[model samples]
Target: KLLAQEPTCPRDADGRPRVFVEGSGAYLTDPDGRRWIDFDNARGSVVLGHGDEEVAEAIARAARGRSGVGTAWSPVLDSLLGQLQEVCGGDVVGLYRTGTAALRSVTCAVRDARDRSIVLSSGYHGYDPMWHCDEPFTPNQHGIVEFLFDLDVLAEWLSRPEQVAAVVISPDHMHLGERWYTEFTRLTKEADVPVIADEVKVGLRYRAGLSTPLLDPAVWIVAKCLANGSPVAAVGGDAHLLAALEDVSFTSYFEPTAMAAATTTLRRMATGEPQQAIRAAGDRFIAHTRAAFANAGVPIDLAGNGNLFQFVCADDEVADAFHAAAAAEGLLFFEGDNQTPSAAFTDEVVEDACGRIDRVSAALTGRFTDRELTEESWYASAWGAMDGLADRPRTREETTAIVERLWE
Candidate 1:
């Protein structure tokens, strides 16, 4: 039988199940009403933070009018499209229910525009069909070959022009360097394949209309969830491809409330408050964390721009272990998840967490050194093993061993 309340780990210094009960303007409150600086602002989706009067008022006003009218035409739809066109350097826009939907639509548009069946990706895109199609050498049920390309090899493929229909990439890869967007646009245009930039998580982090400058005539971009938790997704492409949305036939029916929220949010973002605030907060976090690690003589790569960054542990396993230790310290984070959001990276929280990270790093480094594994050396060896296993069949046990050994 369940007790009135089940037991849990003892609450931390701030109490409230080690979680915050309220939030406002880059801060959160615990059940005890202790305010904590917030960095993981709702998985990086809350652009303006907990309570922005502007977005709240706009959404409230829009809610009074109507919600989803579920039609091709709506004022909210029109307004969001207008804003997207203004921001992302595109001639046209198509709204969708979610980023995965928007991405699927972009892939379909590329196939239709270029009349090609095969799609190319540099890294994981999503669970969408086009992104996760079967590889010829893989034993997965999906039979369609989804060609994966390394960023460096993309230029050569694009040189062929007619062979590839689309090249999709995550501009930021789990704290790796941001993929060179301008170069990507240049190569894809030469190859005649549309470049689909997946900005589902990155759009509002760097700048408003951050992907605009990298856009070429052949590139189509999709974005999602920047309107402070609204369910909205958009696809933008060069005039011709985007105009094709007129006939695409799908219900991205605009919820009036979501539209107004997006508009007001965009206006606030234009003033540079949110971007500036997030960048400053993020910079402080990275600087503090890096210094803590360095002072302890631990080496780590401080990659990623803005607030969205990750500590790419010497290998995926170390990354996993790092996240596990974080969770044990009352921080909830994902281990193997791609684009794992680090929301606790706020200014105040960084002071405490950085010290914890430093301690963990030092402990792990001490243990690892005994195994003759310098971080760099471990990574090189890991890469060699991965390269060797690229085309080989591995049993479930082997796979589990790889993941566990990499970290454990």
Candidate 2:
């Protein structure tokens, strides 16, 4: 049911629902009224946590003044861009209603300037057809040839020089490392191809929303975040790429108010206090979760950045069983096989979610103690072994692979 609404709540391999009803600072309440410590963090949206009072107030004020268009170049919008530059350490900024819009705007600007159409992607960009231009068959792969392999072959197609346009990538993917980004940028530039950084996910979580400096000097990069629960996003890069939007007009009427919320939220984050608190919260939650797995003796590796992490249940079978157990416990979860980020969750929600995870882990681990060994147990062990062997990497391939294997 969740995957059915993908890019939002797509269904999982086991066909279960992964949805949240209400959210507050680092916690979410489901339709059943079960409160959960959300570690996903609203898909990396709520930087200051959900239901933030100041942001809500700002949104309320902006909404009353004018729900869509607050003012032409509204103070809210100006202040928001200014604050974003201050927080992100960038000079230019552009605002849009969603990351999708931001990406489209950036892509259009890039394509317009360079006259390029092909986009070389290291991993997922968005639902945009342009990103998947190389597929040639269809937008949805429908469990056909693995995407990674497809990309590898696509690389050959990109060698044509003129046919290749921009290389779209995430700086944080595990498979493609910082070095790969360096190489991608260098190679693209040498080929006269543009590079685009899809920092939508890495924007605010890993650091202070500026992780795409790897390709900064030449290529264009887009930084999109869940800039508050409201529909807002931002895109920025070198002056050359940004200049393309100079003549184009953007009409985000509600942008100013949304910008106000983002500005205030970013200010709070800049203080170091709020960010540290979130880090501490993440630490505490991870500690408790590790302890739970230890107590249960259910082997599994916890993967993900501090702010956005996940528990990989190893094989599909184990993931299936574990997800079922989690749902039964009133805390739904995605399959570990899918390497997507957990929802933008918080410490409190993570605690509650992990509590249920603990019970399920304990039950599953204990249940298999008497048998010759259940397939599910083997899967759990495999995941644990993999975790013991490797930690998350700082490359694109690794990160993209994690998300693709499980989520894509």
Candidate 3:
């Protein structure tokens, strides 16, 4: 029943609801007043943690004093862009309200400039028709094709420069390294195809400034943590290129309140304290989680770095079962995305969370005692890679339900 109203967090495989009523610093309070340790972090939105007092107050002040046309650029918007440049290395920017908008905007500009519609895509961009590929629901792939993270396939695609307008990488693939990105960027440069670093996910989480400096992207898409969970984004690059993006404007792009919240949030973020804290928090959390798994006799290998990480499941089935088991035990994590560690996850908080994970791990060990998992990495066994997601039909009713859920 709650799923109808709230689809932001999906139900467990066993049909357990993932809805929540409130959130505050590393925890989500369900409707029943049960607070689950939140590693999801609103899918990489809250870095300082949910309901951060300073950010909330900034929004409040901006909502009253800064209320105006979100479309028109303001001082607040200018300040937000300047702050973003510090992190993403961009000059002038075109303001936006979501990562998807910034993505589509960049795609439009690239497609128009190169006169090529196809974009060599890898990793998750956003929930837009333009980016969706190989899905039964999105009948039109909008010229976006996935390289499947295969360099050979990407090399083939990049070799044909006329067909590929841009090479976009989300840069959150945990297993990938500098050499991988070096090769990835080299291929794009060789083909003269524009490289777009979609830092919306990894921005502020992994590192404050330019997550993948190797990419040397022609354009940088920044959002998600830009406002510490508030709605705001920016598509920026070279002076001329960013100027070209100015023509593609939307009224919702520049929300004064969101920008006000962003200004305050970015000020705090610029210090790099939040990044350090979250990284430290991740280190502490992972150590405790690993110990908890051992105590419960549930051996699991976790992959990725300090800020964003994930549990490496052997196979798809085990991945689903583990997340569901964790859900049942009031430990909510991102099934499809990396776990976003927050600064709010201090030593005491992780200890509390580890206690719960220990219980969940014990409960899970009995169910899979005789079973063995494959050597599937996080992405390989992620819910996004599961057939269930690919096979699920996207209907008007289903879309509306999701829209309403996000609206809430």
Candidate 4:
């Protein structure tokens, strides 16, 4: 039933979902003690790799000292904020418990600053309602107008400057080869609409500096890799824009364990060795995987870069079978999204992952017949439901009706 709703968890031929009991560095271990090379990297959160000693020790110390204290200011919090500001190039910073919270806070901040309700957004920001509205608006996306990451659409939206309060995006779009961001950034700045970069998944992996440096956004919403795996997020931006949060009230924003984790993590990231090594390994892995797939005659397109990549297969069933087979061969690729390599991925580890890929490719060759292809894969229904809405303009009423039907 869980697999029925959450298609990301690939099920075996007998319908049992794969489960991991422990992780260290670049591998995860199942209950039976079989280890899988972790390409997902906990959805790109474990940038320094699983069970990083420094980050773990920092969290342990903070937990031993204080685990559930109120959100009062402390030296530790100050130190963390200071480190973030130094690395992220923000005038001020605000802390939240999750990426969703940080995104919502930034939206509210932008809304209050401009006194407008219309938000132009591209890319997956989070599960937050404000980030929804492609075709079926979710319950929380009340005033969002979603668009394909296209220049013309953004130009049209920004032309009516009175309608837009803010524009939000993820750095994922920049990987589209063409410099779409060049025009998008210019137009937004020309119109004075605040641009927010949701770097929750790809921020720390991009470079030593903040992901905002890539696009020069007004606000930076960073999480996931911020505290390794700790549940902490941050919003950093222009001082005046961030002041919008001064009157906002949050009860558990300053959790100590997350603060300690982020402080240690950010400090290390500032040195830039981890990101450099991970990116180098990522390039090698991509080359190896592409060559392996090509030699095996597998129809796959590799996308993304710098430690994050996706294997676009010929069909969903093939993709599903590939994931299942990879798991059976002790490789855990992220199901719905790109695979993330971590700094812990050494030459030996990546080579082993490539070997596993080779084996899975060989085993699955000529295995997908017409009947198998026709079988409904786990994500088919959901993926089909949301089709044809990518570039469609949706009215609030229309979106609400679609959301209502989906809920029903």
Best by TM-score: 3
TM-score ranking, high to low = 3, 4, 2, 1
**Candidate 1: deviation at residue 155, Å?**
4.5
True-structure lDDT of candidate 3 = 0.69
Give the 10-residue window scoring lowest on summed lDDT in candidate 2.
137-146
lDDT of 2 by residue, 1-408 (tens): 434444544244465445677766655677778765543444456566577787788778766775346445555666666766666644477766666666767766766676655555454555655444333212222211112313333345456768554555544533234665565555666677665666666665545555556765333333334345556666666677667767655565445566666666666655555545555666566677667766665555554434545665445455566666665675533334222222244454556655776777775786433323333333343233222112223254553544343331
Please list the residue runs of candidate 4 whose C-alpha ends up more than 4 Å from where it truly belongs after superposition: 1-17, 66-72, 134-141, 173-175, 212-214, 367-408
Which candidate would rank higher by lDDT, 1 or 2? 1
Tens-digit per-residue lDDT, 319-349, candidate 4: 7777777877998877646777888898889
Clashes of each: 3, 48, 1, 2
List RMSD in Å for every model shown: 7.3, 6.5, 7.3, 5.7
Q: lDDT of all predictions, in order shown?
A: 0.54, 0.53, 0.69, 0.71
lDDT of 4: 0.71
TM-score of 3: 0.85
**Alpha-carbon deviation at 277 in model 4, angstroms:** 0.8
Ranking by lDDT: 4, 3, 1, 2
TM-score of candidate 2 on Cα atoms, chains taken together: 0.73
Total colliding residue pairs, candidate 2: 48
Worst 10 residues of 1 by lDDT: 383-392
> If both were scored by TM-score, which would come out higher, candidate 2 or candidate 3?
3
Score candidate 1 by lDDT. 0.54
Residue 77 Cα positional deviation in candidate 2, in Å, after optimal superposition: 1.8
